[PDB]
Amino acid sequence: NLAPLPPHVPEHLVFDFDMYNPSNLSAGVQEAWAVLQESNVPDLVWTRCNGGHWIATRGQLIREAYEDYRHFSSECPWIPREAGEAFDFIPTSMDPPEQRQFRALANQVVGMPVVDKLENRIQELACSLIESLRPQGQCNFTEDYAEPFPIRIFMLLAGLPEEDIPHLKYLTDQMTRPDGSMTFAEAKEALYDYLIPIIEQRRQKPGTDAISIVANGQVNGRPITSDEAKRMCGLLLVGGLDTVVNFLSFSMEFLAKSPEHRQELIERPERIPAACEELLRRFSLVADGRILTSDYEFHGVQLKKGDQILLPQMLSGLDERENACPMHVDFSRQKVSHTTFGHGSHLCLGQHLARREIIVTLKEWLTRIPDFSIAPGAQIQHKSGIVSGVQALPLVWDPATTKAV
Numbered sequence: 001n002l003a004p005l006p007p008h009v010p011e012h013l014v015f016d017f018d019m020y021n022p023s024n025l026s027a028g029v030q031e032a033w034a035v036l037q038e039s040n041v042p043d044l045v046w047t048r049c050n051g052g053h054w055i056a057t058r059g060q061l062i063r064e065a066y067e068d069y070r071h072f073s074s075e076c077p078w079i080p081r082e083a084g085e086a087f088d089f090i091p092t093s094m095d096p097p098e099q100r101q102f103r104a105l106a107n108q109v110v111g112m113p114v115v116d117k118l119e120n121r122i123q124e125l126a127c128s129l130i131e132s133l134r135p136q137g138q139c140n141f142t143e144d145y146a147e148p149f150p151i152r153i154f155m156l157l158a159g160l161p162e163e164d165i166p167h168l169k170y171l172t173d174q175m176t177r178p179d180g181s182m183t184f185a186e187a188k189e190a191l192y193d194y195l196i197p198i199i200e201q202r203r204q205k206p207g208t209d210a211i212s213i214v215a216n217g218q219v220n221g222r223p224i225t226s227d228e229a230k231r232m233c234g235l236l237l238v239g240g241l242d243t244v245v246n247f248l249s250f251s252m253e254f255l256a257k258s259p260e261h262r263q264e265l266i267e268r269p270e271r272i273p274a275a276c277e278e279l280l281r282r283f284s285l286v287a288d289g290r291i292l293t294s295d296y297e298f299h300g301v302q303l304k305k306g307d308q309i310l311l312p313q314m315l316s317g318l319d320e321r322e323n324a325c326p327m328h329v330d331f332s333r334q335k336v337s338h339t340t341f342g343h344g345s346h347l348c349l350g351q352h353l354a355r356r357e358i359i360v361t362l363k364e365w366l367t368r369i370p371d372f373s374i375a376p377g378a379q380i381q382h383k384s385g386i387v388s389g390v391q392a393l394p395l396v397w398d399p400a401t402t403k404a405v
């Protein structure tokens with residue numbers, strides 16, 4: 001259950017939050033993590049759950065920590081400690097300066113110039129999927145659209161066969177929202193086990209897919225090793241399969257319950273990109289962290305070298321000190337303050353691909369199925385972890401209120 005309180009951690013700063021099953025989960029995951037911003041909760045607390053660790057609860061602290069890599073290192077970014085010690089993905093497990101050389105390489109495979117190229121492809125797939133669903137007046141969103149749409153796009157970007165999707169996604173989910181059937185370490189090993197032969201192959205005979213791009217690449221002008229290429233390709237895999245997939249579900253669940261919000265985007269589709277930022281803020285879903293490199297006093301609190309600290313990227317934008325009425329989705333919100341794609345030198349490299357996928361989904365779906373809702377009796381369930389998700393999303397709609405385009 002709870003790890004004993006280390007001697008240096010003040011008893012009054014204890015707030016036993018469990019990031020993998022928070023107490024108020026039933027009210028929605030975002031709402032569940034928002035209990036850390038309750039009236040009598042401090043900016044920095046210590047939880048005894050999951051081996052024991054700090055949690056910064058406010059945007060001000062989360063951004064500061066993310067900026068100061070000298071004290072808050074990416075070397076051990078996952079909780080529990082076992083998992084963060086085993087976590088060696090590139091470039092996430094590395095801090096500046098040696099970190100940058102790899103971001104540049106990774107930005108060649110998912111960056112903006114690559115996203116633009118992907119445009120038509122992305123629309124074709126979203127339009128393909130929706131039109132096929134349109135006449136049926138129902139669908140379970142997670143399996144019929146949230147997963148296939150982004151995953152097939154990445155599998156194509158990666159040059160990897162779709163048949164391997166069931167296996168890879170299972171490994172991916174074990175890493176972010178563990179089943180208990182395997183440790184982060186075991187799931188990482190399998191991921192690596194899958195990539196090793198593929199990377200050797202792409203190096204032997206170079207293709208134009210993200211995998212061979214990475215594996216035949218250079219960093220700081222020098223050849224990348226097979227091992228560095230594996231560590232980086234596995235992280236790319238995590239991003240392509242378990243991020244947008246979940247976010248699309250939180251947004252669509254919201255739209256299914258918000259006729260007025262849908263009418264706004266139906267009426268002025270030009271508000272869709274704005275609406276995407278506000279949904280990215282409101283349905284923020286990532287939370288990883290750092291490890292203290294040395295004894296350090298932070299905001300009046302004594303941190304010790306080795307202490308792990310959770311810096312929920314999700315929390316910043318729900319922080320009322322950044323955005324008034326944080327839980328209200330306001331497509332017109334004047335300043336949408338968030339750290340959904342992270343903060344600091346580790347800013348998400350897939351963010352551009354992620355927005356495209358979102359804006360396109362929103363645009364192509366609202367245009368064909370403007371009116372829909374959540375299947376009657378459905379008790380939508382959320383799931384929490386490094387990356388939070390939606391268990392199932394049964395949608396229903398009257399076919400006669402739809403249009404083909």
Ligand code: HEM
Pocket residue numbers: 077090091092093103106110154235236237238239240241243244247285286288289313339340341342343345346347348349350351353354
């Ligand atoms: C809604 C979608 C997404 C969200 C909210 C998101 C969020 C994040 C966050 C919060 C981080 C920072 C982690 C840290 O600082 O420890 C990150 C890093 C990263 N993400 Fe994204 N991500 C998304 C989609 C994607 C996609 C689609 C990809 C590519 C397949 C991707 C690739 C990466 C990579 C390569 C990094 C590491 C950057 C580094 O460590 O320098 N992400 N992402």
